[PDB]
Subunit: 429 residues, 4 copies
Amino acid sequence: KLPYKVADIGLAAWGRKALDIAENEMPGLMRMRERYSASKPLKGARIAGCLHMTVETAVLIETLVTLGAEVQWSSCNIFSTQDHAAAAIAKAGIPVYAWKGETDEEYLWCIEQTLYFKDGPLNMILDDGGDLTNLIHTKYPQLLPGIRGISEETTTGVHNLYKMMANGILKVPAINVNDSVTKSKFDNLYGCRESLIDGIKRATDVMIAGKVAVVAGYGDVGKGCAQALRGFGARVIITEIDPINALQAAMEGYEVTTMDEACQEGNIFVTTTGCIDIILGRHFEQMKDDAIVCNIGHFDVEIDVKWLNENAVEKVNIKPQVDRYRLKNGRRIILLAEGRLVNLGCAMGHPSFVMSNSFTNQVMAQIELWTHPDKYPVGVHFLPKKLDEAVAEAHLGKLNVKLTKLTEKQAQYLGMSCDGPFKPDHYRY
Amino acid sequence: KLPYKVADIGLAAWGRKALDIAENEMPGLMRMRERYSASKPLKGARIAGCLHMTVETAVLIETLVTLGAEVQWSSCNIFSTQDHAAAAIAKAGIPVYAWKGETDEEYLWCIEQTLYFKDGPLNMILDDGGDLTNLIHTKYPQLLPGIRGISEETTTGVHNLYKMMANGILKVPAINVNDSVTKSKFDNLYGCRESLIDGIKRATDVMIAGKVAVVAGYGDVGKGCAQALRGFGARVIITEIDPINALQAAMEGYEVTTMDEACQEGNIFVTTTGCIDIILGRHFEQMKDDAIVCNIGHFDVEIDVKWLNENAVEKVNIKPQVDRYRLKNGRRIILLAEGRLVNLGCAMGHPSFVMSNSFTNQVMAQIELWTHPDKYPVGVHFLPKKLDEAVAEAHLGKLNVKLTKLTEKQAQYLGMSCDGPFKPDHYRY
Amino acid sequence: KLPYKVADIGLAAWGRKALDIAENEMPGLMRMRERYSASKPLKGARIAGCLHMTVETAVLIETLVTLGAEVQWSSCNIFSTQDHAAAAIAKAGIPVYAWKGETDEEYLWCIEQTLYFKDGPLNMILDDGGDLTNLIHTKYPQLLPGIRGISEETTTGVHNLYKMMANGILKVPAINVNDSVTKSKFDNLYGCRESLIDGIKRATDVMIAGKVAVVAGYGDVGKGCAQALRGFGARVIITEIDPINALQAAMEGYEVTTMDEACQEGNIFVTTTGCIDIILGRHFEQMKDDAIVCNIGHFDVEIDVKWLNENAVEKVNIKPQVDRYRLKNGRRIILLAEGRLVNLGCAMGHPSFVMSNSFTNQVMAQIELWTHPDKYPVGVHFLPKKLDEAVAEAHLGKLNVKLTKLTEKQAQYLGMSCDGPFKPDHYRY
Amino acid sequence: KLPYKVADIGLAAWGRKALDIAENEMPGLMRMRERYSASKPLKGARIAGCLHMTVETAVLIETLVTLGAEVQWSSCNIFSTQDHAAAAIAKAGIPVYAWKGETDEEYLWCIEQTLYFKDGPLNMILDDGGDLTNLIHTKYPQLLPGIRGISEETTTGVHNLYKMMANGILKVPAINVNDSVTKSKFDNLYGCRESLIDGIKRATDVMIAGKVAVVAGYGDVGKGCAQALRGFGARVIITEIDPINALQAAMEGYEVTTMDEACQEGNIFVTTTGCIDIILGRHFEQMKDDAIVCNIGHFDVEIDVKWLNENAVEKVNIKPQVDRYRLKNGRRIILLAEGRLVNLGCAMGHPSFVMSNSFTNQVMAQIELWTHPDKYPVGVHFLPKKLDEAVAEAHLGKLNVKLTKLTEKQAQYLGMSCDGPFKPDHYRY
Ligand SMILES: NC(=O)C1=CN([C@@H]2O[C@H](COP(=O)(O)OP(=O)(O)OC[C@H]3O[C@@H](n4cnc5c(N)ncnc54)[C@H](O)[C@@H]3O)[C@@H](O)[C@H]2O)C=CC1
Ligand SMILES: NC(=O)C1=CN([C@@H]2O[C@H](COP(=O)(O)OP(=O)(O)OC[C@H]3O[C@@H](n4cnc5c(N)ncnc54)[C@H](O)[C@@H]3O)[C@@H](O)[C@H]2O)C=CC1
Ligand SMILES: NC(=O)C1=CN([C@@H]2O[C@H](COP(=O)(O)OP(=O)(O)OC[C@H]3O[C@@H](n4cnc5c(N)ncnc54)[C@H](O)[C@@H]3O)[C@@H](O)[C@H]2O)C=CC1
Ligand SMILES: NC(=O)C1=CN([C@@H]2O[C@H](COP(=O)(O)OP(=O)(O)OC[C@H]3O[C@@H](n4cnc5c(N)ncnc54)[C@H](O)[C@@H]3O)[C@@H](O)[C@H]2O)C=CC1
Ligand SMILES: CNCCNC(=O)CN(CC(=O)N(C)N1Cc2ccccc2C1)c1cc(Cl)ccc1Oc1ccc(Cl)cc1
Ligand SMILES: CNCCNC(=O)CN(CC(=O)N(C)N1Cc2ccccc2C1)c1cc(Cl)ccc1Oc1ccc(Cl)cc1
Ligand SMILES: CNCCNC(=O)CN(CC(=O)N(C)N1Cc2ccccc2C1)c1cc(Cl)ccc1Oc1ccc(Cl)cc1
Ligand SMILES: CNCCNC(=O)CN(CC(=O)N(C)N1Cc2ccccc2C1)c1cc(Cl)ccc1Oc1ccc(Cl)cc1
C-alpha cells in the first residue's frame, strides 16, 4: 500500500510557505491547536477525510493531528487539490492521496486508500459532499459499526444523509455543520462578498461603479454579492421568488424586479439562486452590448450557456475562464468561468479566514462525536449552538475583539449560562 | 354597559384623518381587506383584542371587521393609547375601552369590558403581552372553552404561554407570531433603525456625524441602531456577550470592545441588550461631558438610572424625556426617556409600515385559528412559514416590487411548490 | 436710545441653559475663546452684526466679546430669532434688538439700533444676507469710511457684494466666508444630511426604507440628502442638469433621470436645485398616492405650490407645516413646510456643530480684517485657506481627532509650511 | 526611418481584441468619434504623443486619427507599454515606438522617432509627464515655433510647465487637464477606489472584512481607498496632516489618528499621501504579524522600504510584487509592489472607464488648441469648464443617465446658458 500519492512531493516547501501564511488567516484552527495540543481530545481517532486538498484544508488536517488524531486524506473533487499543499501534508507523514487532474477512477481510488490505517480501519468520517460517506455505506458497510461518527459541511452531503436516514441506510451518527451560523455566514455571505468583484475584475478589469448589476437571488450568497457590488458604486437590482427575501432587499433600497425586465438594463449579471434557468436566450437577446454574465450559485445550471453556444455567431476567448460571445443581433455577451462559479474560475475561491470558519466547525463536530458518542443516536444532528459559538469565539482574537462576559447576576437575569449558549435554537442572527 | 369609553369622542375626525394616512403605509393590512372583505373569513368571530390603542392598531381593528369579525378592544398599556385613534374606532361603532393615562384599576376594567359582546362572550383572543390571555385563564376560566384560538406577538406573551402550557394552565390553542421573520425583522431591526436617531434628534437635535456611538448589543435592535448611526457618519462601537453577534459586527467593520472601555470614548450610548446593568455608575464617571445616554432595549433595566438619581449633583430637565445630569466630577450626562425606550419617549414609536408587518401577522394568526381549528391542538404554535411569506408578499405591492414566480420546471427542480414555502424551517434569512 | 429690545428678557435663564448645552457642540467658537480671551485680538472693534438671533448665534456673539470686541446685534430675519437666546444676550449687557415676529419696519429699525455704540459708530460689519451692508451703503454712507471691514457668509450677500463692487458702490473691504470649505461643507452637505430625514419624520413619521426618494439636484445639498436617504434604505433617484454632478451620482450607484420620469416612481421628493420649476403640476398629476413632497433648496421657488392650491380638490392640514392635498385624480400629495425649507419648517434647522463651523468662519474673517486692514483693498476677498484650515482644526479636539504634524523634512519635500496652507487654491477636497 | 518599433507585431490581433472590448468602456472617446469623424476637427494636425502605450491609450490614439489628426506615439514609461496594444496601433499604420522593457537610451530614442512625420515635424504635443515637452524645448527648440499647442494631464507635467513659464522657457501654449474635475476625480478617487482592493487581493487573496485598514492621507486617493475598504467590511483608520481633510474623514465616521498610534493596530496599511516617510521602521516594529503594507500614492517615497531591506532578518518573495519580510522581533511584514503603486504592480491599473475620462480630456485639449489658437497665448491654461462638462456628458450615455435640460426660463433665472457652464470656477463639487 502507498504511504501517500501526490502530484509532486517536491512542492512541499512551497506548500509549507503557503500554510505558514494561511495559518495567520485561520485563527480558529490555530486556537484549537493552542487549546488541545496537550489534552489531545482526538487521541485514538482515525479520521478519514474527503475534502478539497487545498492549503486551507492542509491547516485543517494538521490541526486534527495536533489534537491527537490519526488522519488519512483525499480530495472531494478531482481538480480542487493544490499540489504544493498536498505535497506538504504528504511530506509531513500524513497519508494523503490527491492531485489536481484526477480521473473518476483515481478519484474513487484515492478515497479508498484512506479507509484503512496502520492499526485498523477509520473510526471517524470528516466529509464534504458525502462521497466518503456513500462509499462506506455502499461499498464498505462492513466498516460502519466501527465508525463512531460523521461530520458533513455541505448542502449536498446533508441532503444525502437525510435520504439515507429516511431510507434506514444511515448507520453512523452524523453532525451537520452546514447549517451552523459560523459556517453558513462565511461560506455563503462573507465568502462570496469577498470574491465576486475579485472574480469579475481579474476576468475583465471592468469598472464597477456606475454599472447596473443584476443579482438573481437574495439569499446569503445574493446578499453578499449585492453588498459587495453596492460598495463599489454599482446600482444593484435584485430578482427573487421569495417574498420575504425580496422584502429584505427592498428595505435596503435595492430595486427588486424580474430577470425578464432587468435583462434589458443590467451591465453585469450575477446568479446566486441555486436554481436552473435564471438567465436564458430571451434574456441574452435583450442585454446591452458586452453585458458581463456570471454565476456564483449552483455548479453551472443557472445560466443557459448551451443557448449561447448554439446561438452565438461568434465566440472569442479573451483569457482563461472569460469568453466573449457575439449574438445574431450584433451584441456581445461576456461570459465568465463558462457559466460555472466565477469565484472559482476567475479567482482563488474563498479567503482563508472563511475556510477557517467552516473547518473549525468540522473540528468541533469531530471532537463532539468522538468524545460524546453516548449523546448521538444514529441520525443527522445539528452542531450544538455552544459549539457554533465556540467557533466564532475562536476567531475573535485575530480580530482583536474584546468580548464582554455576563456577570452572574446578568446570567441569572437572562436565564442563561455565563458560557452560553446565548441564543435559543430558532434565533436567526 | 358602556358601548365604549374613550377620552374625548370628539377627536374622531382627527383620528380618522390619521388612519387614512396610516392605511397607505400599512399595505399588508389593506391587502387583507381587498382580498377578504368579500369572503368574510372571520365571520362569526367575536375577537377581543388587547393592544396599544394606536392609529396603527386602529387600522388593524378595522381590517378585522372588514374580514367579518366582531371586535372589542382595550389597550395593553395605560399610556400607549392615542385618543384620537380610539375616538375614531368608537365612532365607527366598535366597542373600544382605552385612553391615555389610565389607572391600574381602569386598565383591568377596560380589558374586562371586551370579554362580553352584545350577543355573547368572545371566541378569539388577539393579545400583545399576554394580559388578556392571563386575565381570562385566571379570572374567567369559564370563558375558556368557547375561545377557539389565541395569537401573541410579544416575547413576554410567548414566554408566558410556554410556562402556562408547561404547567397545564394553557387551555386554548395559541399561535406565536413574535418569532415570524416579517414580524421580528420589522419589529426589532427595521423598526428601531428608523426611530433611534429620530428620538435622539428630537431630544437633542445634536449632530450625529463625527460622534462615537457605543451600541451595547448586536442583536436585531443593535444591528438596526448601528446601521442607522453609521449611515449618519458616526463611528459605531459595539459591545457584545455573544461571540457570533460580535463576529458579525466585526465583519461589518465595527470595532467591538467592552463598555468598561468604550465608556471613555462614546459621545452617544445606546443599549439594546435586553439585559440589566449595561451602563453603570463607573461608566458614567468616565464619559465625556454631555454624553448622550439612551436605551432602546428592555424597558428600563439596561441603564442604571437609579445611580444617576442618587449620585449626580444636578438633575436638570431640558424638555420632556430629556434630562441633563451633572456629576461630582463636573461633567454632565444627557439621559433620554428617563432610561426607558428612546423611540417611545422621544419619538413616535415604530413607523406605520413596521407595525403593518406585526399586525398583518396577527390577522394571519386569527384567520388560521378561526378557519383551521382542527390543525391546532392546545399549545404554542409558530406561525406557518407560508403565512409569514404571505405577510411579506402583502407588502411587496406598495414597494412596487415585482416578485418572480417559479416555473413548474424550476419548482420541481427545487423540490418546492410554486407558492412556497420557499425555505426550510431552520433558514435564518 | 434703548440698551436692547427683546420679546421677553425673562427668558434669559432658559436661554442661558440652551447656550451652555450648545457650547459643547460648538468647539470651534469655544476654541477661539480659549485662544484669544487674553490677547483680545478684537479689542477696539465695534462689531454690528445682522444674523438670525438664535442660540448658536448667541455663542458667536459672546465669542466676539471675549475676543475684546464691542458688539451690537440684530437678526437678519423677522422670524429666525429664538427669544430665550435674545434675552440671554440682552441680559448679558450686549445690545441686541430682535424677537420672533418682527414687522418689516421693526426689522429695519432693529438693524439701525446696532449702528452707533457707546463711543461711536460701528467699525466692523458681520453680515448674513447683506442687509446690514446695504443699509449702511444706501442709508448711512457717512459711516463707510469709519468701517474697517465686512464679513459675509451667504450666497445672496456675496452675490450682492459683487454687484456693489462691479458698480463702484462697495467702499469697505469684504471677506467672503460663504465659499470657505468648512463653511460650505457644513452649511450645505453635512447640515442638510443631518436634518432632511429629521424634517420628514417629524412631519410624517413615515418609514424611509423601501421608498423611492427622488432628489432633484446633486450639489452639496443634494449630495447630503441623497446620502442621508440612502442610509435609511431608500432607493434614491437623482435628477440633474450638470453632467459633472450627474456623473458623480452615477458613480455612487444612484439612478439619474429626469423629474418628468421620476415623478411617476418617487414616494418622496426632495428639491435641492436652487432653481425654479422643479416639481410642477404635470409631475404632481403623475405621483403615487400620498407621495411626500418637500424642498430643502431655495426659499419656496422649487415646487409649484401655487398649482397645488389652485388645482387640488382638497387641502387637509395634518399638523403645522404639513398639508395633504387631494387632486382631481383622487391621489393625495403630502406637502411639507408649504414648499419652503423642510429642515426649517419641520425641524430645528442645522445642528449646532454645523453652525459652529459657519460662525467660526465669521470670527476668523473679523479678526483678519480688523487686524490686517493693510492686506485688504476695497473689494470682495475669499477667506485665506490657512484661516479655513484653522476653522477645521478648531473642531478636531471635540472630535478627539489626532492630527498628524509634518516633520521639517516632509514640509520641505512637499514644498509647504508645517502650519499650512496644505492645499493650493484650486484644490476641491 | 522605421515605420514603427514594437516587441512583436504579431500580437496585433490580440491587441485589437482588447481595444474592441475597451472601446465599450471608453464612451467619452467613442462619443468624440461619433461626433467628429465626419467634420475632422483635427485635420492638418500632426500630433506627437508620449503616453503609456496601453490598450486604453490605443483607443485614445485611434480617436485622434478618427478626428482627422496624424499621430506618432511613444510611451512615457519604459515599462508601461502593453505590447499587444502597441502591435495593434502599429498594424493600423500609425507610427508607434514603444515596448515593455525599454532602456533609458531606447526610451529617449522612441520619443525622438515621433517628432518627425512623413511630411513634416509635429505641430501638436499630447504629453503625460512633460518628457516630450522637455525633450523638444531642450533638444529641439527649432521645432517649437511650428507647434500650436500642448496638453498635459499629470501633476509633474503641469508643475514643470509652471516652472518653465516662470523662467521664460515655455514657448508653446499649454492646456492643463490634470486639474479638471472629470480627470482628477476619476484619476485619483474613482480610479483607486476600483483597484486598491483588487491589487491587495491578487497579491494576498486575504479577507478584507474584519481587518483594520490604516489609510495615510484623506485626499482623493485616500477617500477612494477608505471608501473601498469600508465597503468590504474593514474598519478604516485615517491619518492626515490637513485639518480639513481630517474633519471630512471624521464626518464620515472614520477614526482619525496618527500613524505612530495606528501602526500598532492596523492589519493593512495604505499610503496615499504623496509625501515621504509615512511608514517608518519604528512603525514596522509595532505592526501585527503579517501586516500588509502598500503604497498607492507617490511612486515609492511613502514607505521606508529601504529600512526593511536593511533591518529584516528575512525577505522572502511570495510571488511577483509580493514580499514577506521577517523582522528581528519575529513578526513578518507583507510588502506589496516593493513599496511602489499597488494598483500597478499587483493589479491592472486604472479601469478603462477611468482612463476614458483622462484621455477624453486630452482630446478636448487637443481640439481646443488646434481650432482656437487665438484664445491661448503662451502659458499654462486650465481646461475651460464647459469642456470638462462635455467630457462628463460624453460618458452619461453609456451609464444610460438622462440629463435634465434647463428651460429658457430656468436658465435665465439661474443666470446661465442652457448649455453651461453650470458652475463658477471655484465650485468644488
Ligand atoms: N460560489 C460559491 O463559492 C458559493 C456558492 N453557493 C451556492 O449558491 C447557491 C445559493 O446559496 P445561498 O445564497 O446560501 O442560498 P439561499 O437559499 O440562501 O439563497 C437562494 C435564494 O435564491 C432565490 N431564488 C431561487 N430561485 C430563484 C429564481 N428562480 N429567481 C430569483 N430568485 C430565486 C431563493 O428564494 C433564495 O432566497 C447554492 O446553490 C449554494 O450551494 C453557496 C456558498 C458559496
Ligand atoms: N425599543 C423598541 O422599539 C424595541 C425594543 N426591543 C427590546 O430590545 C431588547 C433586545 O431585543 P433584540 O435586539 O431583538 O434581541 P437579541 O437577542 O437579538 O439582541 C440582544 C443582544 O444583546 C446582547 N447582550 C446581552 N447582554 C449583553 C451585555 N451584558 N453586554 C453586551 N451585550 C449583551 C446579546 O448577545 C444579544 O445578541 C429586548 O428587550 C427587546 O424586547 C425589541 C424590539 C423593539
Ligand atoms: N435648507 C437649508 O438648510 C440649505 C439650503 N441651501 C440652498 O439649497 C440650494 C442649493 O444649494 P447647494 O447644494 O449648495 O448648491 P449647488 O450649486 O452645489 O447645487 C445645486 C445643484 O442643483 C442642480 N440643478 C439646478 N437646476 C436643476 C434642475 N432644474 N434640475 C435638476 N438639477 C438642477 C445644479 O446642477 C447644481 O449641481 C441653494 O438655493 C442653497 O442656498 C444651502 C444650504 C442649506
Ligand atoms: N496609484 C494611483 O493610481 C494614483 C496615485 N496618485 C498619487 O497619489 C498621491 C496623492 O494624490 P491625491 O490623493 O490626489 O492628493 P491629495 O493632495 O488630494 O491627497 C494627499 C493627502 O495626503 C495628506 N498627507 C500629506 N502628508 C501626510 C502625512 N505626512 N501624514 C498623513 N497625511 C498626509 C495631505 O493632507 C493630502 O490631503 C500623489 O503622489 C498622486 O500623484 C494619484 C492618482 C492615482
Ligand atoms: C486557495 N484557497 C482555496 C480555498 N478553498 C477551499 O479550500 C475549498 N473550496 C472552497 C471555495 O473556495 N469555494 C469558493 N467554495 C464554497 C462553496 C460552497 C457551495 C458550493 C460551491 C462552493 C465553492 C473549493 C470548492 C470547490 Cl467546489 C472547488 C475548489 C475549491 O478549492 C479551491 C482550490 C484552488 C483554488 Cl485556486 C480555488 C479554490
Ligand atoms: C404613533 N405610532 C405608534 C406605533 N406603535 C404602536 O402602534 C404600538 N407600539 C409599538 C412601537 O412603536 N414600539 C417602538 N414598540 C415595539 C416594541 C417591541 C418590544 C418591546 C417594546 C417595543 C416598543 C407601542 C409600544 C409600547 Cl411598549 C408603547 C407605546 C406604543 O405605541 C405608541 C403610542 C403613541 C406614540 Cl406617540 C408612540 C408609540
Ligand atoms: C436652533 N438652532 C438654529 C440654528 N440655525 C441658525 O442659527 C440660523 N439659521 C440656519 C439654519 O439652521 N439653516 C437650516 N439654514 C442654512 C441655510 C443656507 C442657505 C439658505 C437657507 C438656509 C437655512 C436659520 C436660517 C433661516 Cl433662513 C431661518 C432660521 C434660522 O434659524 C432657526 C431658528 C429657529 C429654529 Cl427652530 C430653526 C432655525
Ligand atoms: C491595462 N489598463 C491600463 C490602464 N492604464 C493606463 O492606460 C496608463 N496608466 C494609468 C494607471 O492605470 N494608473 C493606475 N495610474 C494613474 C496615476 C496617476 C498619478 C501617478 C501614478 C498613476 C498610476 C499607467 C500609469 C503608470 Cl505610472 C504605469 C503604467 C500604466 O499603465 C499600465 C500598463 C499595464 C498594466 Cl498591466 C497596468 C497599467
